[PDB]
Amino acid sequence: YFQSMSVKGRIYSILKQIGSGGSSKVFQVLNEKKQIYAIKYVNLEEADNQTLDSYRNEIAYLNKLQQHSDKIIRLYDYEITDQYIYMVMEWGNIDLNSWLKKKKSIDPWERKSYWKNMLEAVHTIHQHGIVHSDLKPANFLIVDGMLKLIDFGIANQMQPDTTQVGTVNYMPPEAIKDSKISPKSDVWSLGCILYYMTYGKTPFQQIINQISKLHAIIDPNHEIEFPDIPEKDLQDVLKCCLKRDPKQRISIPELLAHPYVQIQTH
Ligand SMILES: CCc1cccc(CC)c1NC(=O)c1nn(C)c2c1CCc1cnc(Nc3ccc(N4CCN(C)CC4)cc3OC)nc1-2
C-alpha cells in the first residue's frame, strides 16, 4: 500500500499504477509537498542502442516542446541512467480513449474544444518536423478538460511477452500501402478520432474482418458514411480529413482556419 521512489533526489510516494506498456509503468504519485504527479518508469535492461536513442530523442523533444505549446504534456523532471528512466509528468484525470469508451453522447462544445486541443498539439510537433504517425485517442490525456498529447511516436514500441492494441482503425491508406512520412498521415488519424466523437465509431470500425478493413481503407470505390448532422462545418471537416489521397487531404494549418474551429456558433 505504502510505496516510494526518488527522482533526482526528490522523494515521491506511490499511490497506484495508472498505466503499463512493454517494460514501462506509469504511477500516480505525491511529492514531499503532497502534489500529485504521474511518474513513467521505463526499463533499459534489454533495450538495444536504437531503442535507447529513440527514448533519448523522444525525451529531448518532449522537454523542448512543452515550452512551445501547453497542449503537450508537462515533463516536470526526469532521471535517466543506463538501467532505467523516470519521468515526473503532469497527472491527468483520464485518457481520451477511456473517456470516449464511457460516453455515448459527447457535448458538441466539448468535441470542438477537444478537436482544437488536438490540432494545436499535433501542429506543434509537425512544426518541429515530427510526424506522430500513430495518433489514437489513447495518445491524448484529459487534464482539466484540456487535451494534452502524451507522446510523439518517436520512441520504439517494444513488446511485454510474459503478458488501442495495434489498432488499424486510425491508419491512413498510404501507410497500409507501405520511408516517406507525410504530416497529412496525422490529419487522417485526427480525422478518424473526430469521426468517432461525431458519429460514435471510426469509419471502418463496423468491418469485422481485418484484411477486409485494410482493403476498405484503400479502395476509393468504397465510400465513407457521413450522415448529415446539425454541425455541417463538422461534417465538412471530417470529409476533408478523410480524403484517401494525401495530396487532396486537408492540412493542419487549414483545419485551424476552418469554420468549425473559428465561427462562434452562439
Ligand atoms: C500512449 C502514451 C505512451 C506511449 C508509450 C509508453 C507509455 C507508457 C506505458 C505511454 N503512456 C503514458 O505515458 C501514459 N499513459 N497514461 C495513462 C498516462 C501516461 C502519462 C501521463 C498520465 C497522467 N495522468 C494519467 N491518468 C490516468 C489515465 C488513465 C487512467 N485509467 C486507468 C485505466 N483505465 C483502463 C482507463 C482510465 C487513470 C489515470 O489516473 C487516475 N495517466 C497518464
- Give ∠ CA 171-181-246 in degrees, rounded to 5: 65
Distance CA 31, CA 91 (A): 12
Distance CA 153, CA 54 (A): 9
Dihedral sign, Cα of residue 8, residue 11, residue 17, residue 23:
positive
Residues 154, 54 contacting (CB under 8 angstroms): yes
Distance CA 117, CA 260 (A): 13
Residue range(s) occupied by CATH 1.10.510.10 in the chain? 94-266
Express the helix, strand and coil content of the chain in percent, nearest 5 each.
Answer: 35, 20, 40
Note the CATH number of domain 5-93: 3.30.200.20
Within 10 A of 213 (CB to CB), how many other CB atoms are there?
A: 18
Ligand 1 pocket member 19 (CB < 6 A): yes
Beta bridge partners of 42: 24, 85
Distance CA 227, CA 224 (A): 9
Locate 64 and state its grid cell.
Answer: 523542448
Residues 187, 250 contacting (CB under 8 angstroms): yes
Residue range(s) occupied by CATH 3.30.200.20 in the chain? 5-93
Distance 21 CA to ligand 1 centre (A): 10
Ligand 1 pocket member 38 (CB < 6 A): yes
Breaks (C-N over 2.5 A) in the chain follow: 163, 178
Contact residues for 244 (Cβ-Cβ < 8 A; gap 6+): 173, 217, 218, 220
What DSSP string runs through 165-230? -S--TT--HHHHT-----THHHHHHHHHHHHHHHHSS-TTTT--SHHHHHHHHH-TTS-------S
Is CATH 1.20.140.10 the right assignment for the domain spanning 94-266? no
Phi, psi of 187 (to 5 degrees): -65, -40
For the stretch 230-265, what's the b/e string if a residue is b when 16 or more beta carbons lie within 10 angstroms of its beta carbon? Answer: ebebbbebbebbbbbebeebbebeebeebebbeeee
How many residues are given for the chain?
Answer: 266
Distance CA 134, CA 146 (A): 20
Beta bridge partners of 94: 142
The secondary structure of 125-154, three-state, reads HHHCCCCCCCCCHHHEEEECCEEEECCCCC
Within 10 A of 208 (CB to CB), how many other CB atoms are there?
A: 7
Of all protein residues, whose CA lies closest to atom 15 belonging to ligand 1?
19
Instruction: Report the candidate in 19, 20, 17 with the shortest Cα–Cα distance to residue 28.
Output: 17
| 134 has catalytic annotation | yes
3-state secondary structure of 113: helix
Distance CA 73, CA 71 (A): 6
Per the rule left: phi > 0, alpha: psi between -120 and 50, beta: everything else, 83 is alpha
Nearest-atom index, ligand 1, CA of 89: 21
Angstrom resolution of this structure: 3.2
Report in angstroms the alpha-carbon separations of 184 from 52, 134, 219. 28, 12, 18
What determination technique applies here? X-ray
Question: Terminal CA-to-CA distance of the chain, rounded, Å?
Answer: 50
Distance CA 190, CA 205 (A): 15
Which of these is catalytic: 53, 82, 95, 134? 134
Q: Has 243 been labeled as part of a binding site?
A: no
Residues 155, 64 contacting (CB under 8 angstroms): no
